[PDB]
Amino acid sequence: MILDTDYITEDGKPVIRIFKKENGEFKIEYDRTFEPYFYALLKDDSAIEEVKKITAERHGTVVTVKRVEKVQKKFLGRPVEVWKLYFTHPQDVPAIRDKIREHPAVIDIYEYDIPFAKRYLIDKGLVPMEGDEELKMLAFAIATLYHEGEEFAEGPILMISYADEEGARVITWKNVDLPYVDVVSTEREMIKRFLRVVKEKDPDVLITYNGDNFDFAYLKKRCEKLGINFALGRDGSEPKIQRMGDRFAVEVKGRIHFDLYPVIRRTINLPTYTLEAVYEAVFGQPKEKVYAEEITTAWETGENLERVARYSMEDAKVTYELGKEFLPMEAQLSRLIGQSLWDVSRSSTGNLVEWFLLRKAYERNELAPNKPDEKELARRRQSYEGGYVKEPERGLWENIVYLDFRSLYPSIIITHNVSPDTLNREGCKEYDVAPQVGHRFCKDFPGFIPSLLGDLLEERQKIKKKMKATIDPIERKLLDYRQRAIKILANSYYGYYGYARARWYCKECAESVTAWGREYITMTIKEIEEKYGFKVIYSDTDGFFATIPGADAETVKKKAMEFLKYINAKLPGALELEYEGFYKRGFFVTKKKYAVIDEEGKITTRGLEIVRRDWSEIAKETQARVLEALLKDGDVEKAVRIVKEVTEKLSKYEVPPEKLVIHEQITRDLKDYKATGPHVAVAKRLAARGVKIRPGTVISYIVLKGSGRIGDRAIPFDEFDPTKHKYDAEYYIENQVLPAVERILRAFGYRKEDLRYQK
DNA sequence: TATCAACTGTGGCCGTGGTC
DNA sequence: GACCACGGCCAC
Ligand SMILES: [Br-]
Ligand SMILES: [Br-]
Incomplete structure (x- = not known):
């Protein structure tokens, strides 16, 4: 199983490292043969000889173009010819790429901002987290001495706690009378003990809760003050703290630092994301919070340290339990996107789509569009019309059905082949025409994105079938998480089309999707009112609530099923209206605010x-x-x-x-x-x-x-x-x-x- | 210098604290 | 006192 890739430098040349876990053994495979590159589109092929000679400098090293190769690719489906420019070292790319673009015979460059180790994963066809390998995990947490107006980490770490399948322990440098507390003499000895615990346990995954922004930075500052080589990496390196925009993130080489906080933030909507709130919401048991002030008081007086140590033990314990709960799913998402769990667990929705698309673009010889420059980005800020929302007939209604479309926007993309490479493509024999907005889409060949979305939805259905039939509980569970990951990805395409920073941004595609959505939902409302006499109480985007005011519950159900038979025979392709449920009563307050109760009382x-x-x-x-x-x-x-x-x-x-x-x-x-x-x-x-x-x-x-x-x-x-x-x-x-x-x-x-x- | 320069869409209701 | 821009976070 592949965990991660990176590179190091050896005599000036890049050496790719592939971090693997095969059969219970950590392994590093090295590759010295892979060359960084990006593409240049030229006004004329004879300018390659000038471009070959462009040079730059890198910490006193001359940067040159190693070799070139003219290649045929597709750009939005159409044939194009570009020059593939190869380099010795990935840090040559940022040193020289602007100078190559600025050359007058260079129209533009492409695929020049792809981290080398991720380029390697894509071009080699390698996929992280494939297999059934069981990873070894270890959660940890710290408790510190806080006083209000101090610099960060001016105070010592008081306790370090950790937990895994064997239970949870606390290392501290005061005497605490609890069986799971190990006592050392000083803060330094405590940190060194923890480092020894990690090295001996040799976990594949270090689990924290907000360790990207608190725990590792704290440990780093204390290790600086106390003269400790904090050598947690499996190659002996220290944790690597990097800035990603307004946040920090931390790598531990050879391992996966799995910070639960960005994961839980994407996954569940809670009012607060304290560790206590999260544990209770996931597992249904309280967790008592101990505040920084009580911790400091306990340490300074020596009183009630047992409560602090138990809190610290519990932080590690529940962090491990949450890590066990959330990691397998994030692992299947990483496998599906095709990038490392470290990256994927920290990544925004749009970025996951783009990484998936970049890999499929490579497989299909499709040159990737660039990210927008500042001018293009500002152009893309124009908006468009979205979903249809019907003003409700407000109040209390009885004997209601909710009918809604199966994956409306993905069904539309697939059915009408909505893609920037099909948008107003000239010379075809078949088109679908988006209502209101008028864009035509070629149907003669599957668009890039519709084709991928179609394959995704079909794989999800095959997986659900194999899950039902399977007898192996391990395999069933892997399948479950993969089918869940596909749903997430498939439902992200529409918003990516309208995403100003996207490489495959397509405003015409997005507003075509939403226009078709409005036509379908309003057409269906009109049919159930005019042909079956229902009252539509309320409707938002892809479904609607309806009843027959003076009418029995079994009457509303049966007639809803008849209307469904009628309507799905008229709907094209993948568009399908489904029976979502029956509610005994419903209360509609405003657009987007309502509540319903089902027959069972829920x-x-x-x-x-x-x-x-x-x-x-x-x-x-x-x-x-x-x-x-x-x-x-x-x-x-x-x-x-x-x-x-x-x-x-x-x-x-x-x-x-x-x-x-x-x-x-x-x-x-x-x-x-x-x-x-x-x-x-x-x-x-x-x-x-x-x-x-x-x-x-x-x-x-x-x-x-x-x-x-x-x-x-x-x-x-x-x-x-x-x-x-x-x-x-x-x-x-x-x-x-x-x-x-x-x-x-x-x-x-x-x-x-x-x-x-x-x- | 050792890595993507940053965190998807639109439609809608509401509380706060400011202006006139 | 009437009005409204800003900012919150919901639904889909
Ligand atoms: Br109360
Ligand atoms: Br489903």
């Missing part, structure tokens, strides 16, 4: 405050309770009594502050905010102190008693102390609970004053 909620992180739990819980009264018990008066009771509890300071926390994400640098709401006001105050705020940080705050600007009396919940603080009960009534439930009960005539407790 409520499903969309768009309402209940699902959002920027609404306090007390508001969410109460709206949830109002909805159940309506949907389940059809009991409006009980809904009012619930609100009245909740608002009275709040005015009596009987609601625990833990239900008053509001979570809002910082999304940019604090200086760039033009308007400052409460979460930014808090963020700015924390930055004022010793606290780094980066995009993606969730500010979790509570509003304290007062009047005027919310932001002047908001504090991080971390710091809430009921002996020093009084929460703003009128705010949680007037700004949180009542607005959330008024928007629902507005439909039955109740105004805010019918919902408040009376003094």
Whole structure:
């Protein structure tokens, strides 16, 4: 199984390293024969002799063109001839590529920004994470001595904890009376012990939670201060800390540093991504948090260190358990994209598509378009019309069906062959024509992207079939994750077409997809209304809710099935309308906000405050309770009594502050905010102190008693102390609970004053 | 100098704090 | 007091 590739330099020449795990053994294979290259399109082939002679310099070394070769490729399906320029060392490419492009006989260069070790994986046909090899994993976490206004890592590491299949231990340099704590004499001895643990255990995967941005940088600074070679790499190298945009990421050579935080962030939507929140949401058990201040107090006084050590043990334990839960899936995604787990687990959606496409482009001799320059990028910022959203007939309805398309946008791309290489391609014998926007697509040959998307969807169906039939539980599970990875990829193509930074950006493709989507969903709505007499209550993009007002449940179902038979005989190709489910009652509040209940009692909620992180739990819980009264018990008066009771509890300071926390994400640098709401006001105050705020940080705050600007009396919940603080009960009534439930009960005539407790 | 210069789409409702 | 831009994060 291939884990990763990189290169090193030996007598000036690049040596590719392929890090493998075959049959329980780590291996390094070396390749010295692979040459970096990129392509040049020339105005005339005789200019190659001038281009051959262009030179550059690299730390006092002269950079030359090693050799050239004229080659035939396809560019958006059409034949083209380019010169493949070869070089001795990958760092020659950035030293010389601009000078070659600037040459007047060079129209443009292509494929000049592909990291060499990834170029190697593609051109060699090599695929990481193939096979059933079992990887050895090890989670770790640290606890540190924090004081507020200090430089990063001015304080020592206090404990290092780790966990694997054998359990969890804690190394520390004070005496703690717990069986899983190993005691050494100093911080230095502790770090060296941990390094020895790693080297002896020899894990393939080091699992952290936010180790990209805290743990490794901390260890590095302490190792600098204490004179420690922190040699975690399997080749003896130290961890490699690199900047990727506004974030950091950390490699450990020969291993996979699997930082769960970016993975969980892509995978699950939670209000906060504390380790405690994540563990509870995935596994369903609490995890107690110990705060930095208590940790420091415990260390400075020697008191209650057992609680700190257990917290530290638990960080490592739950980090290992989460790593076991999330890694196999990220592994199948890496295999599908064809790049390393380290990269793929940190990568954005658009980047995964592009890496997949670059590899398939190589296999098909398709020259890759370049990323846009600053001018082109600014041109691409124009937008287009998206999905159809019908204004709901608002209120409570009974005996509802939801019908929606199977993978609407991918079905469209495939059925109508929507691709930049088919877009208005001249001279064909068959075209499909996108409604409203008018773009024609050639049907005579499969477009590059439709062809790949089609192969993907077909593979996913074969996999689902083999899963059902298989008898091997290991294979079944690998198949499950691969089928899940294909769905993710296949559903990413439409947004990639509209992605300004994409190489295969195609605005005409994207707006053709959405125009076809609008035509299909609105055509289908009109058919079920006109030909079967349904009322369409509400519809968003690819599906709709409908019933027959005065009508039995089995009547609505049967007639929905008849309409489906009728409609799918009219739909072309892969377009297919499906029966998603039957809901006994539904409550439609606005566009994109509604809730339904099924026959078994299960409520499903969309768009309402209940699902959002920027609404306090007390508001969410109460709206949830109002909805159940309506949907389940059809009991409006009980809904009012619930609100009245909740608002009275709040005015009596009987609601625990833990239900008053509001979570809002910082999304940019604090200086760039033009308007400052409460979460930014808090963020700015924390930055004022010793606290780094980066995009993606969730500010979790509570509003304290007062009047005027919310932001002047908001504090991080971390710091809430009921002996020093009084929460703003009128705010949680007037700004949180009542607005959330008024928007629902507005439909039955109740105004805010019918919902408040009376003094 | 040892690596991609950066984090997919549009449609929609809402709270805050500012202006007029 | 009426209005609105900014920014949050949802649905698909
Ligand atoms: Br499915
Ligand atoms: Br409560």
